[PDB]
Each structure stands twice: as structure tokens, then as C-alpha cells.
Amino acid sequence: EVMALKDVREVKEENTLNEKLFLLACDKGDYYMVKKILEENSSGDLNINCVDVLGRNAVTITIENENLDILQLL
Amino acid sequence: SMGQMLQDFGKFLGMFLLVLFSFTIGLTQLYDKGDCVGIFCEQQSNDTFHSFIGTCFALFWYIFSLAHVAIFVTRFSYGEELQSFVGAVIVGTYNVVVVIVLTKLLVAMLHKSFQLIANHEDKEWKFARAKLWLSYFDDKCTLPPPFNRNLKQKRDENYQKVMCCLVHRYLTSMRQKMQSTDQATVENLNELRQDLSKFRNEIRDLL
Amino acid sequence: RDRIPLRIVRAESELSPSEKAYLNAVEKGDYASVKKSLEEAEIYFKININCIDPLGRTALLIAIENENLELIELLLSFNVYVGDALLHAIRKEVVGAVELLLNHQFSEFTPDITPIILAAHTNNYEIIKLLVQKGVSVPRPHEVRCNCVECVSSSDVDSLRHSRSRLNIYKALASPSLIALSSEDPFLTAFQLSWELQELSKVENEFKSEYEELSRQCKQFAKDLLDQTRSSRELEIILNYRDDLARLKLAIKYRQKEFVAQPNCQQLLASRWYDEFPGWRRRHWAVKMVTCFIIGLLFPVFSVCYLIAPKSPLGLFIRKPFIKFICHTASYLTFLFLLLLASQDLNRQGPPPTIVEWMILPWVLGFIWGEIKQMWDGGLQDYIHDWWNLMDFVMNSLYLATISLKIVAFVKRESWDMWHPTLVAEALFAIANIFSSLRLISLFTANSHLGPLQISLGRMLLDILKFLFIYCLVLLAFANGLNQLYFYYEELTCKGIRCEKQNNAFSTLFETLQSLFWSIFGLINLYVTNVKAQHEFTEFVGATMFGTYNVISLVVLLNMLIAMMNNSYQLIADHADIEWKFARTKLWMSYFEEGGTLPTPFNVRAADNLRRHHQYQEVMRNLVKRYVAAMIRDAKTEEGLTEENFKELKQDISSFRFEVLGLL
Amino acid sequence: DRIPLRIVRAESELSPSEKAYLNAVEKGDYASVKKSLEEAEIYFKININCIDPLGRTALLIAIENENLELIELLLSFNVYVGDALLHAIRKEVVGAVELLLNHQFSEFTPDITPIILAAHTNNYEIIKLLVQKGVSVPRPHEVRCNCVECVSSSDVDSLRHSRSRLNIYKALASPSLIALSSEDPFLTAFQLSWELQELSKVENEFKSEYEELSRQCKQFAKDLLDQTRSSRELEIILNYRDDNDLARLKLAIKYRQKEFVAQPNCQQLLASRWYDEFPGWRRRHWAVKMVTCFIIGLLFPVFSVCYLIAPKSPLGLFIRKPFIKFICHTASYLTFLFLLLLASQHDLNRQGPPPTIVEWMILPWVLGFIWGEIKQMWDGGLQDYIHDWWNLMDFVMNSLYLATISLKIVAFVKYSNPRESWDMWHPTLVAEALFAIANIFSSLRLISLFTANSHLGPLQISLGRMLLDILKFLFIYCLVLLAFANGLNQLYFYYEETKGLTCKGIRCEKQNNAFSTLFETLQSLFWSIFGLINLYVTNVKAQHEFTEFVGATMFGTYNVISLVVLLNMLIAMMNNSYQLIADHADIEWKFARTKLWMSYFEEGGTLPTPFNVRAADNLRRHHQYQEVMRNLVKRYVAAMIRDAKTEEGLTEENFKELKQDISSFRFEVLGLL
Amino acid sequence: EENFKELKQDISSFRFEVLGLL
Amino acid sequence: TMDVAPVILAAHRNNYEILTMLLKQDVSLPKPHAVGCECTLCSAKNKKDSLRHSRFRLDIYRCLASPALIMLTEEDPILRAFELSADLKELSLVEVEFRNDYEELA
Amino acid sequence: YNQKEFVSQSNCQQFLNTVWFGQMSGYRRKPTCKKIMTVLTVGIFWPVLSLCY
Ligand SMILES: CCCCCCCCCCCCCCCC(=O)OC[C@H](COP(=O)(O)O)OC(=O)CCCCCCCCCCCCCCC
Ligand SMILES: CCCCCCCCCCCCCCCC(=O)OC[C@H](COP(=O)(O)O)OC(=O)CCCCCCCCCCCCCCC
Ligand SMILES: CCCCCCCCCCCCCCCC(=O)OC[C@H](COP(=O)(O)O)OC(=O)CCCCCCCCCCCCCCC
Ligand SMILES: CC(C)CCC[C@@H](C)[C@H]1CC[C@H]2[C@@H]3CC=C4C[C@@H](OC(=O)CCC(=O)O)CC[C@]4(C)[C@H]3CC[C@]12C
Ligand SMILES: CC(C)CCC[C@@H](C)[C@H]1CC[C@H]2[C@@H]3CC=C4C[C@@H](OC(=O)CCC(=O)O)CC[C@]4(C)[C@H]3CC[C@]12C
Ligand SMILES: [Ca+2]
Ligand SMILES: [Ca+2]
Ligand SMILES: [Zn+2]
Ligand SMILES: [Zn+2]
Ligand SMILES: [Zn+2]
Hints:
The structure is cut from a larger assembly and holds four copies of chain A and three copies of chain C.
Chain A: E1 2-4, H1 17-26, H2 31-43, H3 58-64, H4 68-73
Helix pairs in contact in A: 1-2
Chain C: H1 17-28, H2 31-42, H3 59-65, H4 69-77, H5 85-92, H6 97-101, H7 115-122, H8 125-134, E1 137-139, H9 149-157, H10 159-173, H11 176-182, H12 186-203, H13 208-226, H14 232-239, H15 246-253, H16 263-273, H17 285-296, H18 299-304, H19 313-317, H20 321-343, H21 361-376, H22 381-385, H23 387-411, H24 421-438, H25 451-486, H26 509-518, H27 536-572, H28 576-592, H29 606-635, H30 643-663
């Protein structure tokens, strides 16, 4: 008798690696790969509104980091 | 502080009045079958419990625990041992519930009320003293009890100038307080790490 | 010997200078130096990857608390031993735990600790989420009172390890993140977990503070989860959920005084309390008293309605819980006024008069029937838990004894025996009148001013009785001594202490107990210690016993009671508000029910369930999303720095400095 | 239906170029401020004195951040400077040398000079630079004055005068200014704490500010004493006089420095001077201590006559030890109380002479007590005599003893008959009553000996501190008592009777005429607290039930208001008072015990009561005290910097400085690369 | 404040080393 | 929570520069009803969502009780502070469930 | 408006003291004996001052 833990409600979707790369470069201030990822977004490989584990978008992440240049780029 | 804490006495007076009313009903119901009449006598007879107001009088002088009403007033005049013992037990239960429980409870609530009140007693005293002084500042009531526009615009301009100065001083003072007294958070450390990683990435891209 | 020759008793094993250089290279964060050290560690040389510091810090661990992800990747690329390094990363709260999981003796953590247990002790939502995505399970503990062969075998092998493992399991289960993530109903899970932790704290004398704080944490999690509601539709979905406010009654059952006495839930309860009567909060207190008196005085007309035609608007006026409460209190006040009139032809047996004691009987019968009806619902557990139910039982027992004694006298002054049935019947009637009029203390919970005072009173009655036990011990001791001394002198128009001239105060044990009881109030005079045998030594010894008892019971024990009552009230008054609101909503739900609405003198499918479950699940995922958002924005900021964060900041700037120096 | 929100306090929004200048100096880059200032040189839209509506001028922003290169950059461009030196002083930036060496809303009170604000900030470095440059604080007048300048300033502007005086006293009371610029920092701290206490008494407003300043001065004196690491330095400090005396210790006791006196080092020094020539007494076994104290107690008169006939003898020098002197004085007082007890144990004489067994050797002891009180009053003044309540009690008991002696000699030489036939104002009866009251006061003086003991000492001190609150509540109770006494006297004085009664009053078996007069009403209401007044005293002989009911109601109201209300209020209020004063019980107990100790340190008044009846040396003393003060001040400022840089709270401005440093570094390498 | 001064000194030392390199 | 605005949240955080640059544009906040107002407008929103109505009133009064909004839009900040403290105290007396927030605002 | 903190401000309290003592600003700096003497002198001849007003 052991309770098996499971995720009852889905909150984070991984999808492709580009969304996770964008999320990781958003909270690290990696401006040049951020603009490369945005150029690929203009090409159309990923969606701008990406939900992470915390439920915060890229705009919310860069607002929390208090960074104006990359927010202006977004 | 005493005037502020009298509300505790009122709120507890309600509960004590209910307890007194209950025990008065019980003793009056038990003792109604049974010169100077009452407790205001040299020999306090059993007739003190023969009426409702007399029972309230007798149980009122039991609060102080100073033998104001002696215990022989709970004795029947014709030797009914069960009724006299039951009345004595009722009076003893009343004396316990009042003296050894309710009075100590009132002491505890006064402890908490006075510990809360004494933090700001200077402010309330200064407010009351200012009210007392403002009662005497006016010239409409001067003699003791036995013997008894352009200006508006200028005032508005002066008050607006002084208010603007006070606003500016308050703003600079309070921004100094937020810059000088607010402690750092984890978000500040995260922002510092973010700036350091930004500089690291800039160095990586340039070099 | 002049000086203490300090040495190292636990010598352990030191490290080579090359190994120490490698360890401080990992500590500094230089990429190139650690890379070169691991290049010479690739060949079988002095520098080994499995190097353990005398402090116990393997180089992988030094990389773990330095938060250098690149250094951790470099170390794991060369296959250093991974033991409790995942546990160290979990406790450190780094996002390197995923790459620690993605790979393929002295331990800081206890052997019963698994990654999920320590992640839940940490209470990190991200780490728990990644761990349950990888696939973990918490082992289910046994029951609170269980007798299993494996349980007693583990207790015989190691009781300390068994208790620590059970405490770690219950610490892992009681974490807010694991409940909000892995349970279908977080509210029911929190309620049952808090109840289980309270029962475990009662069962386990040791570790009582741990289980108590875990149950408090579960109650706090339920309160903050209810705090995320921003609509009354969500509140009515949650509180009416049954798997009538079923969840509210469940929370009252589990004694959740923080989920209850929440302003949203209290606002909903107040809206249900004044059913179809708005503007009541916007009124003057004199108008409040006038309306209460004019509804209470007209109560039997309202009770006439709903007895014949329940569909009338006046028959629905009694359905309002506040009007029903007012009518019940007015009925009790009418019964007390009838008792007062009864209290206000000297035959051996007496039929009751016409005005009183005959009109009283329907109220007594209705009280007995209502006590039986409330004993039907909830069993005998809630009857013995509520002290007012015990008071009602005692009062009704006294009333039925009075009626039985009156009947016995009827069908079977200054002349009867003291054991006569009429005298006992009237004495029990007086005591039952005391109990009936003292029942009105329980009416104070509805009032906002006399409520918390009465709740604090009922909370500290237990401590008062605990003191009365030791006082009764002291009374018994001194009464035994005084009766032993004074029973050789016993002698009369009035014998005892209840006469004008008190005599034989310590002649018998019962009279000694009575005199020592009355000596607290000063109602026993000083001549009662004087015998007529003119034995001055025994008189002085008895007076010394009386003085010592008076000192102990008045200067010592009474002020001791004062001090401990002060401490108990100071402890109580912090949560007196939520305790009063818990009692008030219990009193409100006592009248919210549609059964037993008459006063005392007159009381003698799967599709909808699936829709309810879907609505509750949507509200629950919204609530836990808001809760984890609130915890993220209250934990990532508004919290003081540790000494480590600055340490991490120092490692970051240092690694940046060595990277810049390596580049140039 | 909706509240309109419009800016009322309107300010100029400047220009976007000036906003670029402001965020450039906020970021901290070097080239952008250069370009903006060079554009301002050729009269662009950017001006040098860009006044932010928050008052954040670019010079003030560059001063707020600790970047001295930008500070020198805008100081080289002749940017207008106002109170920017004061801003740098308040910000506590060491680089105020650039502002010092250069050449109405103003965020500062107009009488604030740089030295006053530097002393307010308590920065040793900035105060040192300002004193080196040359500054002067205006000399404040004393606490109570009527000179024309101060009354003229108060008539013109009282708030400005009060703020300026408070700022001057805040500057003078700073530890750094006293450590740096005072000749005697201990004397300066003592006198400053005294003036700040007197100003807190006089200025009812700003009482907390002056009390905090006085506590800061006392705390500074305690910390300066804390830096003594040798017994020679402590003996130099404590014995120093301005003109083995312990003159500075007596001065600190006079100035009420409880924390300075109760420091463990001077406590150990006072204990060493207390147990004079007592090897290992402080570690002896307790009943051995009691036996030895008893032995010295029975041997007080032999030591006293040894000091009488031979002070140079070792027996005569044994009384010179302060502990032995205290023991012999306590033994003398115990012998006096034993004689007082023997006075009552073992007459019809109208002119009774003093018995030779007890009362004849009571008289020389009374003369000794009176002469000792006179000598104590002469040596020390009358202010310290009235400051001690025990001295007032001793004066009362000696006045009562003198009155008893005078009444006894009057009854001997005049009014020379059975006892029951005497007058009620007979002088022998008055003499006996005053002797009894003096006996009570003499035996109640024994509580002053509890201060020496370490267990009863703090308890007795705490009870003495709560006596003031006792009297404060007794005033309120006395007002209640007079109110109800006049009410009952006005109701009940019509029903006053004699009826041939042997009793009239509440003080016998049949209590009657309880409220007939105001004196009897006060007595009967006084005894109702202890429940010695029965309920039938509110009854009249007439059949007037209404007046009896009114009297019973007023008696019950008084009983409630006293016993239920005021007694429980007093219990709670002294609960709070004892909670407040038990935190500092040790320092006040040690202060009182040291006062008791140096009561016995002086050579005068050595005998117990029955037997009581130049320039070069001063210059070298000043040099030694100045070198000890140099060492103490150096250690204190070192510890001030140590404790000051380890303040466990980290603010949010330093995070902004870290951000500015990182941003300036980033901009510098961006300019380089 | 000691560790804040340590941070300031370390960042200043890194800045001055970078200036010495270039 | 949806009942807030940028002006309401800016007054909630008590940020003077954010408020004074959000007040450059014309901004109007909804005037709350009196503590004794029981009109049809007050008797229609509460039936729909009493919790939302109470939180909206609390957010409006928390925005109005901010110091910086009192500086920026009022002729007399002293009188506004006095009247607002009185109104918030009587709201705490009336709104028994939310009396802690109104008491702390007063 | 029950502004206890506004009233108990030191500036407001000092202004109240200056208005309250009136032209006798030297009473606050006077010694205590002179204060009781002033109170007794003003209280003893109060009907004289009342009739003279
Ligand atoms: C100026 C400030 C003074 C201090 C503050 C005073 C505040 C007011 C004090 C209380 C109100 C006045 C007294 C009222 C009682 C009275 O007048 O009571 C006076 C009368 C006395 O009547 P008899 O003398 O005829 O018995 O009491 C009665 O008539 C008996 C029936 C009524 C009983 C009321 C009892 C009230 C409870 C008082 C004791 C509470 C004990 C609680 C602790 C266990
Ligand atoms: C109303 C809300 C507040 C009160 C809530 C309930 C708490 C109080 C419950 C009281 C219950 C009855 C108490 C007992 C009275 C009684 O039995 O009194 C009844 C009899 C008295 O008999 P007589 O009156 O005939 O002499 O007591 C005896 O026979 C003597 C032996 C028993 C003594 C019991 C004493 C119990 C403790 C009470 C004194 C505590 C003093 C502590 C000093 C530090
Ligand atoms: C049971 C556990 C809890 C209690 C633990 C023990 C603590 C209490 C110990 C008490 C020991 C006895 C004390 C003396 C009483 C006695 O025996 O008193 C006995 C006799 C009484 O004699 P008569 O009864 O013959 O008159 O006292 C005397 O003879 C008078 C002279 C001695 C007086 C001593 C008084 C000491 C203080 C006691 C009262 C304190 C009141 C303080 C008010 C502020
Ligand atoms: C001596 C007795 C027999 C008669 C005289 C007293 C009664 C008229 C009083 C005593 C206690 C009173 C009760 C105390 C408390 C309350 C709660 C109060 O109502 C509320 O507080 C409702 C809930 C809410 O307001 O939130 C007013 C009615 C009631 C039952 C009161 C009704 C009137 C009572 C019975
Ligand atoms: C009826 C007469 C004889 C009086 C009966 C009581 C005395 C014998 C007692 C009461 C209080 C006692 C005193 C209480 C405290 C102290 C302090 C203690 O001495 C010290 O602590 C000395 C200083 C030190 O040790 O640092 C013992 C003596 C003395 C004076 C005690 C001496 C004996 C006294 C006077
Ligand atoms: Ca019941
Ligand atoms: Ca003296
Ligand atoms: Zn089991
Ligand atoms: Zn002057
Ligand atoms: Zn409306």
C-alpha cells in the first residue's frame, strides 16, 4: 500500500525545444539569442505567448527581471 | 487608561448580572416557602432569601468575600436540613463562580486590556488634554459658573503655498525613508544575477 | 600541567595538496582550472574524481551549492559518483536537479529520506512538479492506531528510525505544494490530513509539537486556498460541494477554525443568516433592539403559521434563520418568565396550580424531545463534546426527577422528614431553575461583544478545573489533619458552622470540609478553633493549621490562579476572534437546517453529479493556480537574504572574472 | 458619478533631453554625461541646473551614488551647488572633500549647518574633516533662562527656536563629537545627560527626543568605560577629579548614571574596596559566612572602643573595613530594635520616669541617631537628603523621638491618679503614642538593609519603584472616597443620636453613627475595603425606608467602585508596572547597592550609633588621565567602526549602488570594445 | 554591510583588472 | 482580480512617480456609494456577485486612501485625510467582515 | 474627526501649549514652587478677577 503521486492538473506544456530556450534566455538576459529566437518567431517556428511552470509569459519574466531593452525588443 | 478600560467592566458586568439573576431565581424558588427584616440587621435572618429583590441584595454582598452576609442566613427557621443544605450548596457554588472564577477572569481581562492600552496611553491623554484645552480656548464662555472676498482668496493662496511646500517636503522625506530603511529582498539578488549574466553574455558575444 | 595540549581526537583523513588545489578550484569556479584538473584526473593519477573533503564536501557538492550549472555538467560528464547529490541539489533549491536526474559512508540526510520526501519538505513547487513528472511515490503510512507485524517488527528493530520515518512521511504529505499538485480535492485532503496529524499528536507524546505544527500548516493551507476566491459563484461551488453547505459542515466537523472565520465564508454565512432581509447592517442600535423585541414578542403568531399552512409568506417568515433564532430565544425567555412566576396550601402533596407549574410542562416535554432529537443526529460524540448539551441533559434529568417525585408524592410544613419527596422535588426544581437560567450564557455567542469573552471563559474552564484538582488535594489534606486533631472535642440548639454561634466546625470530616471551604470567603470565625476543654496547646495547634491553610489557599494558591489565568487569557486572546466566529457559525448552522424549526411549546442523477464535479474541478484548478501564483510572488520577493545568496553572487562574479581572464 | 483625478500640485515636466540627462546620470555612464555637458556648453535644450520635480538635481543624483568621478565631472562644469554638501553629509559619503574644497523647500531646516548634520549622522570621518576645516556650533543657553534674546526669539518664532535648540543638542550629544572634540568625554557625557534630562522635564513636547539623547549619552559613557582593559586604567578613570577618593564614581552616582555604575569592572573594583583585606570571602561557604557575620555582630562594641582608644591598632583598624563597618552598624541597629522590643516587655504613674533597665540607654542612642542625621545633612547638602526616601523616614522617626523625649520631660516636670482617669490629651499618652509610631518607623527602616543582599535587593528595589504608582492610584481612590463620604454624610447626618450610648462610632461591638459626621464617614468608608464595617450601619432608628435604601445603594456603589473596579485596575496596572521594571532590575539594584557601599567608604561616621555621640601632581594627573582617555577613545572609535560595519540589516540603497557599479562597468567596457 | 563592502571591493577589483588588461 | 485598473493598482502599490505619470493622461475612477446607500444600483450588483462588489469597494477605497493620490488630486490633503479616515472607520463599523482592511486604511 | 495622532504631534502639542499659556510664556520655565504659587494666587482671588472682568 503506497500512494502513487500523479499530476492531476496539467499546467506546463513543453512542446518544442525553442519555447524552453526562449524561456531560459528570457530570465538570463541573453539578448542576442533572444533576438535570434524572435527572428525565428517572425519566421513562425514558435508562439510568443508561452506558459512556463510558473504560468508567467516572456513579458512577465522580463518584467520581473526589470529589464527595459529586451522588453522593448519584445 | 481607566476610562478606556471601563468598557471591559461593562462587558463583564452583563455576564455577572446574568449569573446573579440565575442564582437569585434558584434561591428565591427554594426559600420562598419559609422588627428588622433582611440583611441590614444585627442578626441577618433567613427572610433575606424570601423575596427576589432580597435575594439579589443578599447575593450582591457576597461578591467582596469579606463576610458581609454570613452563612447562617441559609438556614431554615424550622429545621429543614435538606432545604438548608441545598441552599448552602447553592450559595457556595455562587460564591465559587463569582469570587474564585469571575473575579480572576476580570483580573485577566484587565491585564490584557491594560497591556494593550498602555502602548498608546500618551497619545490618548494628549488628545483628551487637547479637547479640554479647546473647551477653554473660546471666548464665548469666559466667566466662571457663579458669575455668568479678498481675505478668503489671500488665505486660500497662503494655504496652497504652505500645502505645496509640505507636499514637497513629505515626498522627499518619504522617498528618503524608502531608500534608506527598506531591506533588500531575494528579487534584488535575482536582478543582480540577471545583470551579471547580461554582462557575461555581452562579453561572450563581443570576445 | 599548565597548558591544555589541544589536538585532533577525530583525526579522519587529510588530502593531498593537488587534491586540495582541485577542490578549491571547484570552489572558486574557474572553468579552465577545473577542466585541467579533471584532465589529469582522466589518467590514473593522484587527483581522483571521487575525492571526499574532511568536511564531507565532494567536488560535485561544492559545484551544487555554488550554483554553477556548467561546472556540474562538466563534473557529470566525467562520471563522478552520484550519491546524495540529488538530495543536496533538492535542498539547495537549484534547477540543476533535472540534469542530476537526467544522468544515465557519511550522508547528510537520513536513509529514510527519498527525493520526493525532501522535495516536499523543501516545499518547492517546481522541484515537486519535475519529480512527479519523472515518476515518484510517497510510501503510505499505517493507521494511527494499528497492530501490524511489520510495524511492531520495525519498532523492535529501531523505534527511533520508525518514528523519524513516519514524521518525515507526514511532513512530506502535509506540504501545500504536494496537496495542491497531487490530490483531486485539496480541501478534503487538507481537512483529513489536519485531523490525522492532530490525532497523531495526541497519540505520540514525543514529537507533539511537530505534528501540531503540521496540522496548523494544513489548516493554514486550507485558509489560504479559500482566500483565492474572487467570486461568490466560486464560493457557493466550494462550500456546497458534496462527494446545503456540505463542505462548510465538513470543515466545522474537522475543527478548521481558519477555513471557517474567513471573511468571504463569514460574509456568505451572514448572507444566509439574514435571509431576504437586507439593510439590517445599515440600522441604528435602538431600532435594532426595537425590531428584535417586536419580533420576539409576536413569536406565537409566527409559530401558529407553518404548523397548518407552511406555504404562506408568514409561514416562510419563520424559515429565516435569524427570525427563527429570535423566536427560539423568545420562547426560552417566556419559559424563564414562567419559572420566575412559579418562584414568586401547605399540604403534604400538591397538585400544580393553574397559573404556573401546569403551563410549564409542555416546555419541559419539548426540551426533552428536542434533546432526544439532537441526540439522534451526530451520535453521542457531539453530545459529549458540547458542554451545553451536557448542561441540558443535567437540567432535563433534574426536571424529570422533579416530575417523578411529584407524581410519587401525589399518588403514593414544619413537620415532615427531611427525606420527604416533596422537599427533594422542590430542591431539584430550584437547581433545575438555576441550570435553565444559566443556559442563557450560550446565547452570548450571537452577540459581537459578549461572544469572545464567553468563548475565552469556556476555553480556560479546563485550566480552572486542573487547578481545582490540586486545591481539592490541599483541602483534603488540611481537612484530614484538622478532623484528626479536633474530633476528640465534639458536643445544642444548632450544631455546625451555619449557625449564629458556630460550633463543632472540625468535629466531623464533612463539617471540616465545609468549614475549610467556607474559609476562603472569610465566613468562618476564629472561635471555632477553641475547644471547651481549655487545652491551649491543641487550640494553638489547630489555629496554626487553620492559619497555614488560609495562607496556602488565599495568599498563595489564589494568586497562583490569578497569574496562570493571566497567562491563559494572554494565550487565548490571540485566536479568541476566530474561536468566537467558529462558535457563532456553529450556532448559525444550528438554525440553518430545515428540521426542528418549531419552538419548544409546539415542537412536540449521475449527470448532475458529474456536472457538479466538473464545476468543482474547474474552480479547484483556478484556485490552485492563484495559490501557486501568490506563493511565487510572496516567496521570490519580500523575504530577507541568506548568507548563501551573497555567496552565490560572489561565485558568479568570480567565475565571470576567471572567464574574462581566460578570454584575454 | 465618477471621481475626476487631475494633477493639482503642478510641476514643470522639463524636457526629454533633460530626462535623458537624468537617466544617464542615474545609469552612471561617463561618455553620455560628457556629451550632454558639452551640448549644454553650446546652449542645447539641456541645462546644468535641471531641477527635477522630486528635487533630484543631477549633482544630487551623482552625490547620492558613490561615484566620485562623476561628482568631479559635474563639479568641474560649475554646476550650481546649494545644500549638496549637506546631502553628501547625510548620505555619509567620505568623498565630501570635493564639496569642501570647491571654490522655502530645501530638504533641510534653515539653521542646519554642515557640522550639525555631520554630528547627527555620527560619522567619525566626516566630523573629523569638518572640524579640521574649522567649524563652530552655537552655544545653547541653559535650561531655564529669561534673557531678552531667547524670549525675543520665542516671541518671533517658537517652533523654529525649539527645532534649532533640539538640533544643537542632538549635535552636541553625538558620541563621535564628544570622542573627537571634548577634553573630558566622561564629564561631557555626564553633564550633557543631565542637561538633556532637565530639558525633557522643561520641554513637555519633544520629551522623547531629549530622553533618547540622554540615554544615548549614558550609553556612550558606558561604552567608553567598557574599553578599559586594565585595573590601573580603571583606577585612573574612577579616581579622577577636575580640581583613592573615587571622585568620578561619586560624580557618576550624582548624575544618576546607572549603567555606568553597574558596569562589571567598576562593580569588581567596588567589591574589592568593599571587602577590604578579605582573602577569599567572595568564594566562602554560606553558613560559614553567616557564622562569621554573627561573630562580628556580637563584637561591635569592642571594635568601637578599640577605634576610640587606638585607631592605629589592628583592632582599631578592623572597623575601617567598609564591610566590617556595615556589619557593626547593622548589629547596632539590631541591638536598638531589641531594646525597643524590651521596652514593651516587663502603670498608674502620672509622672513616670524612664526605667533604668531599657529606656535610660535608649536616650543616648536617640542622640546618636539625631547627631548622625545632622552630620549627614551637613555633609552632602539637603537636595540629596530629600532625594532619598529613607532619609525622610529617618527624619520623621527622629522628630517623633525628640517629641517623645520632650513630652516625657514635660510630664516629669509638670502634671506630676489611676490610669483610667487621665485626660485624653494627657502628655504621657501622647508620648507613648509617638514612641509607638517611632518604633514602627525604626523597625520599618530595616528594609533598607535588603539592598546589600543579592536576593532581596532587586525585589526591594522593584517594590520601591512601584510605590510611586501606588501613590498615583491612591490619589484617585482618595478622590472617590471623599466623594462618597460627602454623599453619605449629607444623607445621614440628620439621623445622629446619643441615646445614652457608651459607644459612638464604628470602632466597637455595636457599630452606630457610621455616617453621622464627615470624619466618621471617612473612617467607615475606609474600613469597608477590608470588610470590617457591617451592613446594619446603613440603617436608621426611624422607619424611613427610602433613605435607608439610598444609603445602602450608595454604600454598595462605593464598595463596587473600590473593591471590584479600582482594586482590580490597580492589580492589572502594577502587573504591567512590574513587567516593565523587572527588565532593568539589576542595574538599579547595583546602583542602590553601590550608593550603600560608598555610604561606608568615607572615614567620617565610622563609629556605630551608641559611640557616634600640588601643581605638578595635578599636571601629571591631567597627563595620565589624558593618555588613558586617548587609549579609551581610540578603542571606542575602533569598536564603533567594527560594530557599525557589521550591522545585520542590509538596506535597499546599497543594492542600487551595486546596480549602478555594474551598469557603469558595463558601459565602460561597451565604450572600450 | 561588511559583505556589501566586499561585493563593492570585488567588483571594483575586477573593473580595475579589466582596465589594466585594456 | 478584474475590478482593478492601472490607476487602482498604482495607488495600491503607493508609487508616486508611477501615479504622477499615469495622472498625466485623463483618468477617472468610479465614485463609491455612501455607507448607507441602498439604491437599485447597489441592490443589483450585490445579487450578481456580492464578493466582487465588496472587493471592488475595498479596492476603490484602498486606491483613494493612498497618500500619493491624495497629494496629486485634492486641493486640501489634510481635510481629505480626515474625511477619508472617518469614512473608512464608519465602513469598518458597517462592513463587519472586512473591518480589518478598512481599519488599517483609516 | 478623532485624529489622535495628528493632535499628539509634537509641533501641534507645542502650538497648543503656546496658545494655552497665552502671554505667560515664562510659566513653563519657572520653578515648581513659583508654579504652585501662581496657581494658588490665581485661584484664591478668582471672584475678584471675575468681577473686575
Ligand atoms: C468616577 C469613576 C469611578 C470608577 C468607575 C466606576 C464605573 C461604574 C462602577 C459600576 C457601576 C456602579 C455600581 C453598580 C452596582 C450597584 O450600584 O449596586 C448597589 C445595590 C445595593 O443594594 P443593597 O445595598 O440594598 O443590597 O445593588 C443592588 O441593588 C442589588 C441588585 C442589583 C445588583 C447589581 C450588581 C452589579 C454588579 C456589581 C459588582 C460586579 C462584580 C463583578 C466581579 C465578580
Ligand atoms: C458561569 C460561568 C463561570 C463559572 C463556570 C464554572 C466554573 C466554576 C464551577 C464551580 C462548581 C462548584 C464549586 C464547588 C462549590 C461546592 O461544592 O460547595 C458545596 C459544599 C458547601 O457546603 P455547605 O455550603 O453546606 O457548607 O462544599 C463542601 O461540601 C466542601 C467540600 C467540597 C469543596 C469543593 C471545593 C471545590 C473548589 C472550589 C474552591 C476553589 C478555591 C481555590 C482557591 C485557590
Ligand atoms: C501546598 C503547595 C503550595 C503551597 C506551598 C507552601 C507555600 C506556603 C507556605 C506557608 C507556610 C505557613 C506560613 C505562616 C502561616 C502560619 O503558620 O501562621 C500561624 C500563626 C497563627 O497563630 P494563631 O492561628 O494561633 O493565631 O501565625 C502566628 O503565630 C503569628 C506570627 C507568625 C506570622 C507569620 C506570617 C508569615 C506570612 C504569612 C502570611 C503572608 C501574607 C502576605 C500578604 C501580602
Ligand atoms: C434576565 C432575562 C431573563 C431577561 C432580560 C435580558 C434579556 C432581554 C436579554 C439577555 C441576553 C439577551 C440576548 C443576548 C444576545 C443576543 C444576540 C443579539 O443578536 C445578534 O447578535 C444577532 C447576530 C448578529 O448580529 O450578528 C441580540 C439577541 C440576543 C439573543 C439577546 C436577546 C435578549 C436577551 C435574552
Ligand atoms: C527583631 C530584630 C532582632 C530584627 C530581626 C530580623 C533581623 C535579624 C534581620 C532582618 C533582615 C536582615 C538583614 C537582611 C539582609 C542582609 C544582607 C546580608 O549581607 C550582605 O549581603 C552583605 C553584602 C554582601 O555580601 O555583598 C546579610 C546581613 C543583612 C544585613 C541581614 C541582617 C539581619 C537582618 C537585619
Ligand atoms: Ca442541547
Ligand atoms: Ca540617614
Ligand atoms: Zn501498521
Ligand atoms: Zn536664554
Ligand atoms: Zn447606491
